[PDB]
Ligand binder design. Structure first.
Ligand SMILES: CC1=C(/C=C/C(C)=C/C=C/C(C)=C/C=C/C=C(C)/C=C/C=C(C)/C=C/C2=C(C)C(=O)CCC2(C)C)C(C)(C)CCC1
Ligand SMILES: CC1=C(/C=C/C(C)=C/C=C/C(C)=C/C=C/C=C(C)/C=C/C=C(C)/C=C/C2=C(C)C(=O)CCC2(C)C)C(C)(C)CCC1
Ligand SMILES: NC(=[NH2+])NCCC[C@H](N)C(=O)O
Ligand SMILES: NC(=[NH2+])NCCC[C@H](N)C(=O)O
Lengths: 307, 307
């Protein structure tokens, strides 16, 4: 008698990094000039660690034209467009940005940021002073573990713009890895991990029930194979899933609940940031994925919390 | 009675970094596996310093599809394509690469390199041993000043492939800088520098005589406004020219010869690499550029060599 909403609560003693959504909500109270300056300052203290590995799959060409338009504007116009994005204003550029996939939005700011650092576009005021609320939000971010810091920054950037085609390459079979998970050998869980690591989403989606759902960290469940597969193709390429250990528990009505913990790397940072993750699966009696939740964990001890 | 070939020899006591072409020629003797491994090792010791600032103007989309094709190949095929490029073999991919602008060729390898570092494509053997000739070439490169090192690497990469559309954005007028040059106020030289720094090549080209020529470092003169302007648009965007000082000397027949020294930054590295440069101008009696040579200098003392 499970529903997606009932499945959401499996393994309730998993401690997620709710400071991430808390800090994002605080950032969302700031004025646009404070938001831009805060991220610029965080960027100046970790921007060298962002890699180009996600750009190649994103298909940036149309967004890069808009990027180049900003390179042609005056100082006043460049500042206006950047505030329009942060304010989520209804402008043509803000609508275009709001329509892009997360990786395209990130690739846009990544390049604008290097251009600012070089003066190819104008940077942010050299003696700029954050408001009191903004300075406190910056302090909070700087105090977070690396994987929580980059999740704050990512969600702050992806949420900009106005609420209004990737190159997906499955890895050659001979170059694919096989995960090991201490305590877990169920092929549905192992091949969830392996097909994710190989970008083989057409095989991956067949592990799901037709009504199956996937819940990304701090987001609502994505329901149905069509929506889940779209999410895979748009946002989930070139991840490195490094599960470590897991536990299996019977559920009502022949269902099985599985918790796996481990680390995940995003191509935006490669091995420079290891994000502590949990995967919570509810498998049907036919051993298909009815529900999987992916959680960013509050601290590294949560990797060892299988009770 | 000046010709381009006679103009080439002005200011002959300018000491250029001929170790750069010497080292490139040595690299050109190596087998492809040695060439790939040598650059990979140099890359592992300076790849974090390459920035994304040149990608946005390059218009990479077609090349990125070919890049992604390599991401889909097996280990054997990825190694074969990389050797085909280094060997300058006649293959369809090598012909495509050979047709691309320098910045597109560099953006291709830049992304392939990050993908290798992350294992998104297969890297280079972990216990690979350079041949004796290759190990000696690597030592030579590692011993060069930073600006000479990146010129070696650039020309080694750009020369790969088979000898078989950028987004050009002039900077808004209010955001343009004006160079200062100790000892030089001739507007033809100052506005050569300023229009280069503003990517304003349509204004820049009008400073040249119709038969005027530009000689890039270690290359043959590019002759005629059409060819020079094409070179500007394809290869010369987002440079930072920081001239320091110069000297003017009369030439025969009302011509004027001018030597300027200073530093140049490429968007590939921003302020991380300052390249020591000389500009050697031969100006017509009408104060137009008949010939300009751009030289990479052998050492920093050449910045002070105006005799
Ligand atoms: C704005 C701005 C600027 C630029 C800021 C820049 C440049 C920010 C760049 C930030 C970036 C690039 C952050 C990247 C973060 C990426 C993360 C945190 C990825 C996390 C993915 C995870 C954890 C995936 C988990 C999953 C698993 C494991 C599954 O099993 C199922 C699917 C999937 C759920 C998705 C400038 C400076 C100019 C100043 C002005 C304002
Ligand atoms: C291959 C390869 C790999 C990747 C290697 C990579 C990634 C190399 C990247 C190298 C780069 C990116 C080098 C960039 C160098 C750029 C330079 C040196 C720019 C110099 C420009 C100048 C000096 C301009 C001077 C001019 C002036 C001032 C003028 O007034 C007139 C016009 C202009 C003349 C042009 C992998 C690792 C995967 C391993 C396999 C083999
Ligand atoms: N047989 C059972 N129903 N066991 C329940 C396991 C509860 C688990 N230790 C938790 O804290 O969430
Ligand atoms: N009046 C002259 N012609 N002077 C020639 C200057 C030569 C210059 N000092 C050089 O070494 O190249």
């Amino acid at each position: 008698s499970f529903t997606v909403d009932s499945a959401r609560g499996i393994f309730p003693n998993t401690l997620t990094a709710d400071v991430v959504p808390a800090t994002i909500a605080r950032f969302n109270q700031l004025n646009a000039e404070d938001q831009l300056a805060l991220i610029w300052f965080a960027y100046l203290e970790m921007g060298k660690t962002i890699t180009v590995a996600a750009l190649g799959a994103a298909n940036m060409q149309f967004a890069e034209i808009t990027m180049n338009q900003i390179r042609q504007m005056s100082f006043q116009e460049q500042t206006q467009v950047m505030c329009d994005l942060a304010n989520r204003t209804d402008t043509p550029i803000s609508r275009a940005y709001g329509s892009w996939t997360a990786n395209i939005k990130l690739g846009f700011w990544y390049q604008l940021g290097e251009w600012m650092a070089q003066g190819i576009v104008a940077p942010i005021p050299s003696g700029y002073k954050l408001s009191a609320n903004a300075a406190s939000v910056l302090q909070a971010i700087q105090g977070l573990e690396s994987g929580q810091q980059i999740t704050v920054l990512r969600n702050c950037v992806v949420d900009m713009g106005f609420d209004t085609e990737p190159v997906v390459v499955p890895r050659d079979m001979a170059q694919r890895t096989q995960v090991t998970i201490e305590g877990i050998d169920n092929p549905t869980v192992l091949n969830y991990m392996n097909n994710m690591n190989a970008n083989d989403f057409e095989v991956l989606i067949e592990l799901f029930t037709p009504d199956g759902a996937l819940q990304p960290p701090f987001q609502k469940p994505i329901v149905g194979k069509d929506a889940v597969l779209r999410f895979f193709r748009e946002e989930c390429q070139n991840l490195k899933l490094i599960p470590e250990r897991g536990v299996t528990e019977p559920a009502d009505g022949g269902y099985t609940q599985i918790k796996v913990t481990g680390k995940v790397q995003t191509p935006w940072f490669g091995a420079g940031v290891g994000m502590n993750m949990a995967w919570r699966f509810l498998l049907s009696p036919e051993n298909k994925i009815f529900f999987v939740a992916i959680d960013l964990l509050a601290s590294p001890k949560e990797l060892l919390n299988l009770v």
